[PDB]
Amino acid sequence: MEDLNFRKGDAKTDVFGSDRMLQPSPVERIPDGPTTPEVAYQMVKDETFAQTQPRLNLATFVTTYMDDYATKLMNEAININYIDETEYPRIAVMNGKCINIVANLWNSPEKDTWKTGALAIGSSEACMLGGVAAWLRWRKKRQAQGKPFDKPNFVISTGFQVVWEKFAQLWQIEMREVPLTLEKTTLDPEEALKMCDENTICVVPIQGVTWTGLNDDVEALDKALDAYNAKTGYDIPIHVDAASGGFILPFLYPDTKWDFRLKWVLSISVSGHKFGLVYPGLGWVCWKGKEYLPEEMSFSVNYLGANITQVGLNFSRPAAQILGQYYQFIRLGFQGYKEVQYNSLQIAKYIHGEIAKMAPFVNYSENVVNPLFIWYLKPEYAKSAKWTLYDLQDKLSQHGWMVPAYTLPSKLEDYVVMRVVVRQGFSRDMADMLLGDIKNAIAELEKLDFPTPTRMAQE
Amino acid sequence: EDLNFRKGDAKTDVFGSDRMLQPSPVERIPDGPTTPEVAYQMVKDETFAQTQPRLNLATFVTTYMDDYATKLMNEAININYIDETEYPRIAVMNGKCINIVANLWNSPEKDTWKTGALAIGSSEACMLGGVAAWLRWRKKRQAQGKPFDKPNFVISTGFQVVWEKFAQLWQIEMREVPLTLEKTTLDPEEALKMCDENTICVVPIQGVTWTGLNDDVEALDKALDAYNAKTGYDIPIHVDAASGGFILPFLYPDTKWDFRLKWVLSISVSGHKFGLVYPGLGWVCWKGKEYLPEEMSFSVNYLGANITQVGLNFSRPAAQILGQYYQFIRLGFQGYKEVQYNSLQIAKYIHGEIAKMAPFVNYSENVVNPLFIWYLKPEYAKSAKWTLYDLQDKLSQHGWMVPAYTLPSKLEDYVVMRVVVRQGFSRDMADMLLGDIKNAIAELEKLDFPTPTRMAQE
Amino acid sequence: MEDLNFRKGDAKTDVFGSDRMLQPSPVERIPDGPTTPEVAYQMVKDETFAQTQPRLNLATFVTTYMDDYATKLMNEAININYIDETEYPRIAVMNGKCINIVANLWNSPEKDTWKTGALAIGSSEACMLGGVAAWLRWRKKRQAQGKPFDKPNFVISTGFQVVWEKFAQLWQIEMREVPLTLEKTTLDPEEALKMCDENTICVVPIQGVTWTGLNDDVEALDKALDAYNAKTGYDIPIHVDAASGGFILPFLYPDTKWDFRLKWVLSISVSGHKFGLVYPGLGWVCWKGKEYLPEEMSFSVNYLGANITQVGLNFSRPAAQILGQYYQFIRLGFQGYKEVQYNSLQIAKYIHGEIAKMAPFVNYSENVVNPLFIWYLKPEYAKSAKWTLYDLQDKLSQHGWMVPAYTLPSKLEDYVVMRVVVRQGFSRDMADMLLGDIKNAIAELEKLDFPTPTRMAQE
Amino acid sequence: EDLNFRKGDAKTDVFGSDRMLQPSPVERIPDGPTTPEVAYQMVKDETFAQTQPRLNLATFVTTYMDDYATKLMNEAININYIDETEYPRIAVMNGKCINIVANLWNSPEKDTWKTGALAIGSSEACMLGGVAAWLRWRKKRQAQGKPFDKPNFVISTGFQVVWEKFAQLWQIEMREVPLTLEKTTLDPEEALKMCDENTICVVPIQGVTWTGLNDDVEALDKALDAYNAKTGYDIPIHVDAASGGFILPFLYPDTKWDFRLKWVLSISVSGHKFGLVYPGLGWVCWKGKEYLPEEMSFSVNYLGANITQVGLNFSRPAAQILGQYYQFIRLGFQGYKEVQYNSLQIAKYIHGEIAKMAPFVNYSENVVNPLFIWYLKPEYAKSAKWTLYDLQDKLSQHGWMVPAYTLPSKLEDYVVMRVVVRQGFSRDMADMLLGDIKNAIAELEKLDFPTPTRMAQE
Ligand SMILES: *Cc1c(COP(=O)(O)O)cnc(C)c1O
Ligand SMILES: *Cc1c(COP(=O)(O)O)cnc(C)c1O
Ligand SMILES: *Cc1c(COP(=O)(O)O)cnc(C)c1O
Ligand SMILES: *Cc1c(COP(=O)(O)O)cnc(C)c1O
Structure with missing residues (x-):
């Protein structure tokens, strides 16, 4: 029987x-x-x-939970290539309907039934498409004016997310960075204007700054640019990087004027896979109207009567995330999105308030407007402590968490902070587990008699 | 109630x-x-109410994987690849996939961790190869005191649209070499005629979408070597191997098309075409670290592996990495060879059956990728009431998508039809298709009047 | 609508x-x-x-993987209560067939088709049943001889597993412990006999000592006990705690005489859920013959229909583990068990050899006879190192592993050791991942300028 | 081939x-x-070829949970509870379950983490309660200079076999109070007659397996208080509440049977009976930490929870802990009340329909747990050709297990039949059972000669 x-x-x-x-x-x-x-x-x-469990990854902004029905629907579409629009025209139209819904969530004034926007794999592609459109609009203007167009730049906070550095490198466009200070913890419009000139293709305020959790004031920027553009004729626009905030502000802060209600906001990008509540592989970019998407970049094809814009960096790609986005829109609606984001924000505020009660810690901001926030060690505590937040990150990893510690960008680079992001599927109960592990970790670190390597490196 | x-x-x-x-x-x-x-x-x-993916014969992109790969990828639906610090085992697995691909392409790079990058498809992979070529050229011309504001690249009119996207999004001039019946793939002398001090690369294609053929990369390399020696322009090749990159290593190992060639400095491929992974996968490799500009890229050490950090996308599904590594382990070289053999043999079978039908003539007698094109015999077409567009419509009534289209420049009078054979399209399914084609022909020959497309051709 | x-x-x-x-x-x-x-x-x-993934738990001996068919079979039986034998008589017979197969793996000379043994939830219940049986045989013996029987004791290595302390405490039976030394790394028979007297109910050699991974030499104990019993007339028996080794030795070391081939081995227990390859909830105890299981320990019930006779501490319990065990016996057979245990042992040997090559480490034993082993810091390395094996345990936890550090039992209590257990489902590829993490952790710990808390506690 | x-x-x-x-x-x-x-x-x-679990009416142990509990428990099949350092969240969850149970039983203990222990069933839980009682008694008698080598305990003859196991495996004398028609449960004064200085506890039972009734714990508590005041023996109660422990708190909250009583120092229950969890769960709680001897137990602090480390088993499935905690959250007090209400109402319904049948008479008019027993009317039995064993066999032909058996001491001439109604046994299934019983009666009444069991009774 062998x-x-x-x-x-x-x-x-x-x-x-x-x-x-x-x-x-x-x-x-x-x-x-x-x-x-x-x-x-x-x-x-x-x-x-042997790596972080996604639901315990608190560094990421990207969706780690969808309900069983969305998950089944997306699994069933694993072999559907979106770009085969002639073969799969219902998904092409569904993509166009998602773009319409997003553009109207952002109060687009565009009258065309089929809104001017594009599917992306994330905010990386969506931001790059917005930036390329801004660059081509500026090139076209300056050539018509008989002005040079070989030295473009754009203006952004030092709180930029790395895709803007990728954009700068891959297109050879100069990025001008406005530093953060404790007095100006978000993009200050007067400071942004100092870096604008005839070669500026756009200014990029951020809704959901990854380093801080805050929102740049888009309305204040729009007002400053309106006066500046009237004085110079440079006609510098805004592209809003709303990677997280684009699916927070419409539901929880509908009266915050940050989107296409603003005169100079000509395009907006978002990560559908962050607070759009879809698994990895989704971004969106919308333009305020067809006149802001250059023909040099784009065409449109009619599928089943829908006019679908054809612009993008990727070609063949999974279609599952379109079905997932459309499911969330129908399954939740405006009310459902509002209740889910409310839960995420309330849990973030809860953790923020509990962190503030702990002796070692002080929060960077009293204002929690996205479901994430950062804190650092009280300066007087840090001076005589043997440990840093890097040591706390390591302790928490021993229980499966990823809670990242990092230094803030320019002029705040002396601040080591720790960030928690609360996504759908991270509950009050899980917050209590995290906070208990933080308190236990503090108690262990306070038993150290000698400084840790990162504590010594800070001297 | x-x-x-x-x-x-x-x-x-x-x-x-x-x-x-x-x-x-x-x-x-x-x-x-x-x-x-x-x-x-x-x-x-x-x-x-649209095409079933397994009956979509227009697409090159994978529509079938086995149950184990599918389960594995489904289980990874919530894993964001770019969180490499959080998911370092997947970051290392990505690096191992890149090593395996670079070695399939005979890279001479000695580093254990090969210079390459994950992509969502050949679109991003091609664009990364082209941007690297553009930056290498800018740096050369700057050092020589020469202008660098008017780049161009050279490609067949049989280009796939991502190269037009590249041309538009980076404002780089595309110079196109036309197709003729005598030169049905990229001709090197005609390509060299379009090269000058501003050419950043020439792009031969392995698996031309319009025709199913391979541009002769070795012939281009030979021509470019003499031209570069004469001019000093130092023009490289980037191979767009979207389909062929996972066909040639297994079925044509002795065809010299890859990093064995002096001027092939980068190669791209669609992992989701004949790499046998569901949608969302491409790869680009460089011949060595010296060909990937620092201005584009950096590398991070995860668990002792050196992982290059270059890409157009950021957050993205990790499932396709697991799927690629699964196929490499589950099939190995022999298994890939047997699957591509099946796909190619079924394509040749259909090609041979098409040639026996009175209306049809194949564009090429040689099938080197699992796809091919045919058109109507000219004498048959002249008196026929129908065109291949009408045949496409008839086949769609049975659920197939089999596309009809005109060939690129100088062959634009040729309306052709294309069949792509992917894993999961069997001999039995080929017999169903061929039976539907014969029935459709029989119905179209009953027409007493020309169809709209037949009239548009007169 | 809302x-x-x-x-x-x-x-x-x-x-x-x-x-x-x-x-x-x-x-x-x-x-x-x-x-x-x-x-x-x-x-x-x-x-x-937020806890250890079972497949990365290298502390446990208990099965964390079975194939999909065993898993489906056991899931389908989740609502089957084993003890309802009148209602589920086929599972009752299946349990008996498992007992037959185990007793024959251990070379029982018992001639009855239905072998004398009992189902258990683990080696805990199985050991207690073996110990209670030894106690009752001894009580009856001493009563018949007109001798006292109120102060029983048993003899075991200080490497005992805690269930024997439970046995001592819950029945108020004295446990006599034979210490470990570097010269006698397993139970020395001569020293064990020195702790024997007229009140000793049994000696317990262990196959798969949890602290060390080694096997007590049962054949040497049997030989010494035969001479001791001939001299004293005390007739002290052996009960083998073979929790791990009972499913290793028959396949990989068939010629090692440790089981019912030995004269004084009257009972043997094993964990079916360790290297018996079944998910948690399975142990077995076998007796050499019916005459060694006292009649007081069998019981009969009628309120579940007909008549059910059993031996055990538990009553109602899941039946799934019986199905799982019988599946493994049929699915693998002798050859399959041999090849699976061979893989586990070979991977343990591989890791053992790679550990020995690392500068900080020295193995406790050159002999790997169960799929687990322990090592400690080279004494010369430890004296000048800033870290201990507790710190290495913590570093490995940051990547999801549990690799436990602990002190050895009596007279070796100054030795902090680390243990790796290789179970089915832990592959060579996973061993390479573990070893890479160990090397990385050593390199980070060697950067410390100050001693850790546990390193300071050792001086 | x-x-x-x-x-x-x-x-x-x-x-x-x-x-x-x-x-x-x-x-x-x-x-x-x-x-x-x-x-x-x-x-x-x-x-x-054996009884379907949902038709097993002999068992008290859960045969149904909803799909979510089942999925959760299946997903935990490879989790070994005892690895508390590796799985500290499940260790804390175990402690929360113990807290919830101890509070269901009105524990006065002030500690956040209540003194209790996980078990595989009431067998281990009862044994832990008995060993704790035995050790507390040993320590007291030693301190008093009194003998402690001949312990005994007192219980109804309706004991479940675990108490016989306890008696034999620990060599402790069991003193049994017989059942009579006049005393269908444990009579306290009769129990006190068997108590002396060597009695370690009295064990009243909530949910007697033989009868379905509850011993009167409050009446026992009152009698023991007077006896202990007279003798100084301080004999405590351990409640074997295997079934009743998850019935009384929801359906009879005002019945004082638990830690509200002075002498109830520990209580055990089967979580897998009316705790509504699949096989493998029991609980024991003590009234306070001072009633769990240190010789049996120690405590470890996992994540800031005090978890007691006492038990007969060691490695074991963790799935049942998740199942218990799921039920507590999924149902809450209201949900448990409505589920137990359904089971009891269906038991009462079957009980009332049985009483209307000519052959039958119920043992008790009072149905306080979801089970009951009946026997043949004495006048009917005398001229009947069949017994309840014959009815058991007939019902087995349709897949049921409905057990017939003789009652314990002094009622051993009574052949009775028992039905247990668990979650997942509905009114519709009760109607099916009652229809099969009636059909079986009609068939047995056609017999012309006595069956073997009928002859064996005369
Ligand atoms: C996430 C993020 C990005 C990058 O978007 P991806 O979806 O990861 O491609 C860009 N900007 C901000 C503000 C982000 O939070
Ligand atoms: C498929 C294809 C592309 C585009 O690749 P995607 O994987 O769809 O992004 C580019 N070049 C050729 C030759 C192709 O066949
Ligand atoms: C596992 C172990 C025990 C405990 O057995 P369980 O299966 O956990 O109940 C007892 N003795 C030894 C030697 C062990 O390895
Ligand atoms: C069921 C029962 C037992 C045995 O409990 P298990 O859960 O089967 O271990 C003990 N006492 C009573 C009253 C019972 O009903």
Whole structure:
């Protein structure tokens, strides 16, 4: 009854009684030959155990939970390539309907039924498309004026997210950075104007600054730019990087005027996979009207009577995230989105208030307007403490959390902060678990008799 | 009696509810919620009335993976790749996939961690290759005191549209080499005629979408070497191998098209085409670290692996990395070879059956990728009442998408039809398709009057 | 239209837009009222994220992987109560067949088709049943001889597992402990005999000592005990605690005489859920013959129909683990068990050898006979190191592992050691991941300028 | 043709294989392996020919949970509870379950973390309560200079077998108070007659398995208070509340049976009976920490919770802890009350329909747990050809298990039948049972000769 080939991968092989599971996974070259599907499944899957669990990843802004029905719907669409719009025209129209809904969430004045916007893989592509459109609009203007157009720049807070550095590098466009101070913890419009000139293609205020959790004041920026543009004729626009805030502000702060209600906001981008409540792979960019999307970048095709704009950096891509976005819009509606974001914001405020009660800590802001916030060590506490927030990050990782510590951008670079992001699926109960682990970690770190490596590096 | 039955309570039947008497939202988010079952049906039911992916014969992109790969990728739906500090095992796995691809392409780079990058498809992978070529050229010309404000690149008129996107989004001039019956792929002398001091690269294509053919990369490399020696322009190749990058290593290992060639400095591929992974995967590799400009890129060490950080996207699904690594382990070289062999053999089979039909003639007698094109015999077309556009419509009535289109410049009088054979399209399915084609021909030959497209051709 | 009850838990509620998920989980009192199944499911499930993943728990000996068919089979039996033998007689017979197979793996000479043994929830119950049986055989013996029987004792290594302390405390039986030394790293028979007297009910050698991974030499103990019993007439028996080794030795070391082949081995216990390859909830105890199981320990019940006779501490219990064990016996057979245990042992040997090459480390034993082993810091390295194995445990926890550090039992209590247990489902690829994390952790700890708290506590 | 088809290769059909022409192993492990599908069928197919759990009316143990509890528990199949350092959240969850149960029983303990312990069932929980009682008594008698080598405990003859196990495995004398028709539950004055200086506790039972009744704990408490005041023996109560512990708090909150009583120092319950969790759960609580001897127990601080480390088992499934905590949150007090109300109402319904049948008379008019027993009317039994054993056999022919058995001491001439109504046994299923009982009666009344069990009674 001996099975000659049991260790070699036949129908009787046990995965963990096989020769293949005594061998390392391939690092440099494809294996010469195959294995059983069960063996290969375990070899790939087992490597993903030893890292952060997504629901305990508190560094990320990107969705780690959807309900079972959205998840089934997206799984069922795993083999649907969005870009095959002639073959899958219902998904092309569904994409156009999502774009319409987003543009109207942002109060677009565009009268066309099919709003001018584009699907993206995240805010990276959406921001780049907005920035490229702004660059081409500026080039066209300056050429018509007989002015040089070879030295473009854009203006942004030092609180920028790295995709704006990617944009600057990949297109060779100069990024001008407005520093953060304790007195100006968000983009100050007067400071932004100091960096504007005839070569500025746009200013980029951020709704949901990743470093701080705050919102740049888009209305204040719009007012300053209106006076500046009237005086110079430079006609510098705004592109709003609303990666998180674009799905927070419409529901919880409808009266905050930050979007297409503003004269100079010509385009807005968002991460559908952050607070749009869809699994990874979704962003959106909208323009205020077709006249702000250059023809040099774009065309539109009619699918089943819908006019669908064709602009993007990617081509073939999963369609699942479109179904997921449209499901969330129908399943939740405005009320449902409001209640989910309310929960996330209330839990963030709850953690913020509990952090403030702890002896080592002080919050950077009293104002929690997105479901995330940052804190640092009280300066008097930090001076005689043996530990830093990097040490607290390490302690929390021992229980499976990722809670990141980092230094703030320019002029606040002496501030080591820690950030918590509250996403859908992070509950009050999970917040209580986190806070209990933070209190326990503090108590252990306060037993140290000698300074840690990062504490010594701060001297 | 349940007062709230139609309004969406726990007893509601989806299709006895008020919501399923209402249209789906076109312009604005609905004011309020519905039950998950109602929303699930409202979204899912809209996807019925379009092509079934396994019958989509226009696409090159994977429509089937086995149950284990599918389960593995489904389980990773909530993993954001870019969180590499949080998910360092996936970051390392990404690096191992890049190593394996670079070695499939015979990279001479000695570093254990090969210079390459994850992409969402060949679109991003091609654009990264082109931007790197543009920046390498800018730096060269700046050092020589030469202008660098008017870049161009050279490509066949058989280009795939991502190169037009690249041209538009970076404002780089695309110079196109036309196709003829005598030169059905990129001709090197004609390509060199379009090269000058401002050319950043030449782009041969392995798996031209319009024709199914391969540009001769080795022939281009030979021509570019003599031209670069004569001019000093130092023009490189970037190979767009969107399909061919996962065909040639297994079925044509001795064809010298990759990093074995002196001037091939970068190569891109669609992992979601013949890399056998569901939508959302491409790769770009450089021949060495010296060809990826520092201005574009940096690298971070995760668990001892050096992972290059270059890309157009940021947050993105990680599932396709697991899927690629699964295919590499599950199939190996032999398994990839056997799957691509099956796809190519079925393409050749259909190609041979098409040639036997009276209306048809194949564009090429040689099938080197699992796809091919044919057109109507000229004498048949002249007296026929129908065109290949009419055949496309007839086939769609049975659920197929088989596209008809005109070929690019100088061949634009040729209306062709294309079949792509992917994993999961079997000999049995090929027989169904061929049977539907014969029936469709038989119906179209009964027409007494020309169709609209037949009339538009006169 | 707006749903007035959306936050309160109706059919439209989103789990994470509900009032319930702004509230803590219940600590003291049952909630007054219900919630939706989806809310309750998340509230309980989400609390389990922030702890060790079972497949990365390298402290446990207990099975964390079975294949999909065993898992489905056991899931399908979740509502089957084993003890209802009149209602579920086929599972009762299946339990008996498992007992037969285990007794025959251990070379029972018992001729009855139905072997003398009992189901247990683990080695805890199995050991207690073996110990109670030894105690009752000894009481009856001493009563017949007109000798006292009120002060029983048993003899065991200080490497005992805590269930023997439970046995000592819950029955008020004296435990006599034989210390470990570097010269006698397992139970020395001569020293064990020195603790024996007329009140000793048994000696307990261990196959798979939890502290060390080693096997007590049962054959040496049997030989010494035979001479001791011939001299004293005390007739002290052996009960083998084979919690791990009972499913290793028969397959990988068939010629090692440790089981019912030995004259004085009257009972043996094992954890079916350790290297028996079944999910948690399984142990077995076998006796060499019916004459060694006292009649006082069998019981009969009639209130579940017909007549059910049993031996055990528990009563109602899941039956799933019986199905799982019988599946493994049929699915793997002798060859399959041998190949699975071979993989586990070979991977343990591989890690053991790589640990030995690292500058900080020295292995406790050169002999790896169970799929687990321990190491400690080289004494010369430890003296000048700023860190201890407790710090390495903490570093590994940051990547999801549990690799436990602890002090060895008596006379070796100055030795802080670390243990790795290799179970089915822990592959060579996972070993490489662990070893890479160990090397990285060593390199970080070697950067410390000051001693850690545990390093200071050692001086 | 596949040469190895019968031998177990990738093409083998389970029921076209050599292995399914062979017997399952009885004595020895098979020499070699088989495919998972064959092994799965070999084990699964043996479980068909026995009682379906939802038709098992003998058992008190849960046979139904909802789909979410079931999924949650299945997902925890590989979690070993005892690894509390590795799984500290489940350790804390266990402690919260103990808190909730202790508070359901009106514990006066002030500590946040109540003194209690997880068990596999009431067997382990009862044994822990008895051992604790035995050790408290040993310590007192030693301090008084009195003997402590001959312990005993007092219980009704309606005890469940675990108390016999406790008696035999610890060699502790069990003193039994018999049942009579005049004293259908434990009579306290009769219990006190068997108490002396060596009695470690008296064990009243809430949910007597034989009868379905509750011993009067408050009446016992009152009698013990006077006896302890007279003797100084200070004999305590341990309540075996295996079933009643999850019935009385919801349906009879004002019945004083628990830690509200002075002498009730510990209580045990089966979480897998009317705690509504699948097999593998019991709980024991003590009235305070001072009643759990240190010799049995220590406590460890996991994440700021005080968890007591006392038990007979060690490694064990953690799934049942999640199931218990899910039920507490999913149902709450109201949900438990409504579920137990349903079970009790259905038991009362069956009880009333049984009483209307000519052959039958109920043992008690009072149904306080969701179960009851009946027997044959004495005048009917005398001229009947059949017994309740014959009715058990007839009902088994339709898949039911409804057990017939003789009652304990002094009622051992009474053959009775028991029905237990658990969650998942509805009014509709009760109607099916009652229809089968009536059909069985009509068939048995056609007998012309006595059955073997009927002859055995005369
Ligand atoms: C997330 C983020 C980005 C990047 O968006 P992705 O969705 O990760 O591509 C850009 N800007 C801000 C403010 C962000 O938070
Ligand atoms: C598919 C294709 C592309 C575009 O690649 P995507 O994977 O769809 O982004 C580019 N070039 C060629 C030759 C292609 O076939
Ligand atoms: C596992 C272990 C025990 C405890 O057995 P469980 O299966 O956890 O109940 C007892 N003795 C030894 C040697 C062990 O390894
Ligand atoms: C069921 C029962 C027991 C045994 O409990 P298990 O949960 O089966 O271990 C003990 N006493 C009573 C009163 C019971 O009903």
